[model samples]
Target: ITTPLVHVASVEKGRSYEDFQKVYNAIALKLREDDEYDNYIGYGPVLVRLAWHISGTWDKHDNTGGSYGGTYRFKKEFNDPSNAGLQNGFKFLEPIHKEFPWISSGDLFSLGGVTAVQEMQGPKIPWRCGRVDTPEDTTPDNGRLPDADKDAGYVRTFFQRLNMNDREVVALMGAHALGKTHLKNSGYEGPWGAANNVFTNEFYLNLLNEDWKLEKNDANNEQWDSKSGYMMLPTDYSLIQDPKYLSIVKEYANDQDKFFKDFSKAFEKLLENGITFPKDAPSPFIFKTLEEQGL
Candidate 1:
């Protein structure tokens, strides 16, 4: 797994899935220990969100970008307008990167998603190793992330660039159920469900059952509001409105098992965007959460 050193100061060490698993373990354990990020909700949700945001930046057409290359470590990439709030996620991981200086930022960010989900008692997301960190100049342009203001048509077309079909797009959006968009963060505000800390199909349920009214928040962003005291983005509501996507949304809404299965699959696909690994490589190692491992 040895890769040529892209940064002069970075180690020229080869990558290994096993070695990276240890790094994953380090992050998982710290997630349990560090509970200060995001209003003391711990780094769990945002760490996962960070992974999704970075990986979501991939464009399938030219194969010029993806989480596989861990390019976000670069300055230009880190400074992306869409990535404004992610500095919190990156700073949260700073200590870990210091401990494992040889690991690429691309790898660390993606692994954070894997660690957060597993530690939170979510599905086991299989991961592969060998993402090489590219230069800062390689950062993809901003605007790759979905706009909270757009509709189903925009959501579908946006994700198609990443090669994600409708089902995958819907499943990944299910993650929105876990964390809310902050007005300060994404110019949008509010959680989709009462339980923003735990992972569940509550997103699907909320989408289907809520009595929504379109309203503008303090941030001047328009989102659907339910008197039950919940919200969904214009883009979030698009899934259920479009007949094709509504079917899948309804599917996940009624069946928690189905949502978990599909979400795990789509999320794993999102995290794994762009890296290549050998066939003989070890299968993804599922790390023990602090609760499970008694850490």
Candidate 2:
């Protein structure tokens, strides 16, 4: 008989939530302390985006990689085309890594993204720990990240290859609510919602409520626009237009709880993309909130 999958928040040999809260506090404090990137847009969003880009390279078919083994620390991996300009996030974490050498690079990188979202007053993404850095040869190849120019069918097909279903795909795209695509960085530009700094279901809310117009940006890219001054990528707007994706979109739009729950699962899956824990390995360590630890 197969053993049940128990979702415990502790691990046998890893830091508990309280322990990781301190690290969260440290990262939050540093985000405030070191406010000097992208005209002071803050390192929070980009770092979160960086972690996503790094882990999105996983391909479940070969089982050669995923977030379980953080291998982006390699020089070649760092130079990935999809990771263009993410060196900023790596440079930002260099000092922190130096200070806490015992913390694995995979852990630090993933934690950085988690800390950023929470500190910026977004959702408290429940993070479980166990990622370890792998050898340079383990780095995934380039071009695994999503393309901005793609349509809904392309997005669905692309994510299906990553082992994501329709609901997971919708939840993952909700992250577009948080950060704008930099034309220089991703060849795409504009924010998806009014509050680009916060992580809310506002992306979905806006998509459902807004009266969008198809227009080309200065970069000559087509995006859906609204009088509320919000924009959505062609791929983003495709969610509501497609029948299958529209079902998931409507579900998240009408229920915040469902969105959060689904988003947490999907986001965790995204972060844990290429990793594999041993059969005997302990359950993931779900880190505590800063408030819970009285930090």
Candidate 3:
């Protein structure tokens, strides 16, 4: 008789919903404490971007590169030119990891993004766990991220690799409402809106409402500058340039609820890309903000 090999569970052992919620609480509390970083912009924006950069590496075609591996902690992915300023977010999570060493890298990185978004007063991103870390050789090469100097066509094509449609791409970019570009990081500068620390529909409203002008930064790169001291990358400017994208942008600008719903769905998909959750895995967790719990 031939022997059948039994399958082993890859999910983290001894973790329950409460365990992940504790992790969420830890990240949220720290976000409140680390308010003085980057001139009071807080850790929220960088944490969101760190989650994004980690997940943004997903390639739908081959299912390579993504948040699944937590390989960003490894030097190859950590040193990626596109990931220049994300070290701060990593450092913020180091202490949390020390406390909850049982959690895998993929889980911590993705959950940090979810926690940051909710704590910053954005939407409740339903997050699921069960990503197991992979080896260093599994890390994807650099230069897969979108270029800031590119045009609208490049913007559309770049996101296609992530399996995002026009509406999804526009919705995801709405996250720019949360953080500003650093000249030292991406050769682009300025906040996309006045409320850079808070997540909102300001990115869409600003794109539709601002009278933008093309100008060169100190880095000598062209970006759309607004009279209100806000800025948009050439890629950000592209949404208005394309009719299909423009329609979605206008809709989001008109309705904040619609924007939040779309963004939450798309962001969750971005983080979960390339991972397989087992059938026995628990339902996605919807975390309560500190305010919701009155903490």
Q: Model 2, range 98-136, lDDT digits (tens) per residue?
A: 776667777788888888877766666767676665678
Tens digits of lDDT, candidate 3, 228-270: 9999999999999999999999999999899999999999999
lDDT of 3 at 98: 100
Each prediction's TM-score against the native? 0.90, 0.87, 0.96
lDDT for each residue of candidate 1 in 1-295, tens digit (9 for 90 to 100): 4432232222227655557767877888788778766776778888888898888887766665678667777777788877878888898899999999987777788889988877767777776555667767777787677777888898889988877898898888888767677887778777799877777889999888888999989988788999987889898899989999999999988887887888888887887765555656556656656666566
Question: What's model 1's overall lDDT?
Answer: 0.78
Per-residue lDDT value at 246 in model 1: 98
Ranking of all candidate structures by their lDDT, best first: 3, 1, 2
* Maximum-TM-score candidate: 3
Q: Write the number of the candidate with greater lDDT, choosing between 1 and 2.
A: 1
Task: Return the clash pairs for model 1, or none.
Answer: 1-14, 1-15, 2-14, 70-106
Best by lDDT: 3
Which is the better candidate, 1 or 3, if ranked by lDDT? Answer: 3
After TM-score superposition, the amount by which residue 7's alpha carbon in candidate 1 deviates from its true location, in angstroms, is 17
